[PDB]
Amino acid sequence: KVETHEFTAEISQLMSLIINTVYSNKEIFLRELISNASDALDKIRYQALSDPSQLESEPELFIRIIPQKDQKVLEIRDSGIGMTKADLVNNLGTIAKSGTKSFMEALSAGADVSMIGQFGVGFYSLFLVADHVQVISKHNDDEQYVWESNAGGKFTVTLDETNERLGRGTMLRLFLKEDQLEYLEEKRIKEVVKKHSEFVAYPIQLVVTKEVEK
């Protein structure tokens, strides 16, 4: 049911550096997350070329941004390849450890947080704008799971029994910091997407909730 795992010391050091930094251009968080989405989609598209049945869990390949102002949550969804529990618990653990080691060495050499994506750990840039994250992911040949963390030193992995079935892929839910609620506004998201994501081979859809003036 609910597994709990501790973050390595170094990974907690990096996650705390990110949340607490006052780096000026925090919008890069969304280029990093879209980038991870485009990659996950590149993976399933290629695998399906020689095995078209890998797509019958979700035929369309897309990226979808859903602000939820009531909940103060910014949602980022794709139909990419998704992630197994083994990816969530162990296999991205070792990718996260190595990428964090390299990324810290770069920072200690005057490198920038906006370079985080070259180290395979772009996902952690969400703490520029969010203090908590839930990751819902569904891989073909595995069940749907929810990975959860608050930048501390623990994260959980839970068999997913409460959300809409995804079909295939990944949804991220960023619980925005109280001072970063601009990233719920449609105009801003359009701003950031068109400045830092010109070259993405998949649709980026925006799901805007507006009251009707009657």
Ligand X SMILES: CCc1cc(C(N)=O)ccc1-n1nc(C(C)C)c2c(-n3cnc(-c4cnn(C)c4)c3)ccnc21
Contact residues for ligand X, defined by CB under 6 A: 5, 7, 11, 36-37, 40, 78, 80, 83, 88, 92-93, 95-96, 121, 123-124, 135, 147, 170
Residue 15 CB, nearest approach to ligand X (Å): 9
Please report how close the Cβ of residue 104 comes to ligand X at its closest, in angstroms.
14
> How many angstroms separate the CA atoms of 33 and 45, rounded?
19
For the chain, strand residue ranges (E) read: 2-6, 63-68, 73-78, 130-138, 144-149, 154-159, 169-176, 204-206
Smallest gap, in angstroms, from Cβ of residue 92 to ligand X?
4
Question: Is the Cβ of residue 95 or residue 106 nearer to ligand X in the bound state?
Answer: 95
CA 19 distance to own-chain centroid? 15
Beta strands at 204-206 and 63-68: parallel, antiparallel or unpaired: parallel
Give whichever of 77 and 211 is closer to ligand X, judged by the CB atom. Answer: 77
Nearer to ligand X, 55 or 95 (CB): 95
CB of 159 to ligand X, least distance (A): 15
Query: 97 labelled as ligand-binding?
Result: yes
Listed residue (145, 205, 39, 172) closest to 47, CA to CA: 39
Tell me the closest approach of the beta carbon of residue 12 to ligand X, in angstroms. 10
Our CB check for ligand X shows the closer of 121 and 184 to be: 121
CA–CA distance, 8 with 13 (Å, rounded to integer): 9
Pull the structure tokens for residue 214: 């009657």
Residue facing ligand X at closest CB distance: 93
Which residues, other chains included, contact 34 with Cβ-Cβ below 8 Å and sequence gap of 6+?
A: 63, 76, 193, 197, 200, 204
The response to whether 131 counts as a known ligand-binding position is no
160 labelled ligand-binding: no
127 is in an annotated binding site: no
Residues 76 and 83: their CA atoms lie apart, in Å, by 15
> For ligand X, which is the closer residue by CB, 113 or 135?
135
CA distance 158 to 85: 9
Which positions make up the binding site for ATP? Answer: 36, 78, 97, 123
Which positions make up the binding site? Answer: 36, 78, 97, 123
